[PDB]
């Protein structure tokens, strides 16, 4: 759904090494293609946060943009033999997988990129813990978390998870707890700064701020329904491009408005720009903020 939100900021790479069977429809992101690792991100009633923040980076896109590094191993195999470090966090993460997909990507405790990999041709179960024997087969990765990536260089390695009356959430170990504690799956937000662990959150306070970046706008033409147009070919203030392009004040503040000498009419893109997080009152710039349902152990009596 929503064909107007198919333009991805930056490079727009929704693939990874190993499962490059749909790279022709995801590099670049076309309109007639069937990107399996992006169609479920626009479905209504599942990930509302990604719908509110459409024009933003993801996990694999952040990896291909030199933002989030790869783990070791970056794609752990599902054929485990009483080991595999990428299973202790997957088993405690209660997710829903509608089969079809064979791989799934999520965020690890260190803050890199830890994903699973299934040998062809297997399909995930209702959770995604193992690929059983094999409609058709979606050669992609099912997003298990509703996080979004962004370009920022804000330092924040001296901050950890600080909650109130919480024992051990997820796979981390905050404070000591030896009395009565519960064991259930709850939705707890998280945020990772520049070179830091998977720091959880308690009271998320976002702040949408628009910018004049070229990826924060669209390019819709009229000459030739409406057809998309490449926004990177617009004129730059101070130089000269291939083609032209006009618009309003927001689009004209970054590109040269030629009015009658243009070939399209770009507008503003809804749901773009960098966001800020409120950490102890001081507004900070995170890198990946999302939601996940893992094991939460609260303090009781």
């Amino acid at each position: 759904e929503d064909p107007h939100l198919r333009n991805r900021p930056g490079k727009g790479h929704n693939y990874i090494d190993g499962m490059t069977q749909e790279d022709a429809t995801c590099k670049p992101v076309t309109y007639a293609g069937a990107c399996s690792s992006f169609d479920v991100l626009l479905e209504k009633g599942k990930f509302p946060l990604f719908q509110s923040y459409a024009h933003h980076r993801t996990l694999l896109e952040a990896v291909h943009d030199t933002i989030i590094a790869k783990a070791d191993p970056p794609s752990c195999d599902l054929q485990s033999a009483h080991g595999n470090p990428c299973m202790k966090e997957k088993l405690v993460m209660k997710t829903h997988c509608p089969n079809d997909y064979q791989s799934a990507h999520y965020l690890n405790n260190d803050g890199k990129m830890a994903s699973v990999k299934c040998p062809p041709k297997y399909e995930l179960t209702e959770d995604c813990n193992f690929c059983r024997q094999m409609a058709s087969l979606k050669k992609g990765s099912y997003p298990l978390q509703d996080l979004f990536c962004q370009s920022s260089e804000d330092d924040g390695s001296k901050l950890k998870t600080k909650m109130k009356g919480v024992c051990e959430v997820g796979v981390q170990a905050l404070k000591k707890c030896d009395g009565q504690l519960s064991t259930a799956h709850e939705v707890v937000p998280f945020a990772v700064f520049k070179n830091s662990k998977k720091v959880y959150l308690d009271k998320l306070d976002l702040k949408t701020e628009e910018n004049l970046l070229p990826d924060s706008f669209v390019c819709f033409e009229h000459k030739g329904e409406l057809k998309s147009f490449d926004i990177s070919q617009c004129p730059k203030i101070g130089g000269h491009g291939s083609k032209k392009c006009t618009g309003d004040a927001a689009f004209c503040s970054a590109y040269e408005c030629t009015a009658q000498y243009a070939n399209a009419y770009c507008s503003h893109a809804n749901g773009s720009g960098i966001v800020q997080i409120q950490v102890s009152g001081v507004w900070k710039k995170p890198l990946c903020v999302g939601y996940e349902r893992v094991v939460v152990k609260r303090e009781l009596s």
């Binding site: 509302p48 946060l49 509110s52 949408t208 628009e210 927001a250 503003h268 939601y291």
Partner: protein, 54 residues
Amino acid sequence: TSAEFSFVGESTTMRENKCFEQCGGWGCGCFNVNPSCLFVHTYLQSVRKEALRV
């Protein structure tokens, strides 16, 4: 329930939705000069670990 914070209303807790009106323009972080709005999803949470029966 707002479409942005629809996942918060899934829990069976006390909550409400009160809209507001704010200014626009580039003075507060807006692309359009028209007066913007505000979406607030306020939900209640317990404080004291003990209750009273009156």
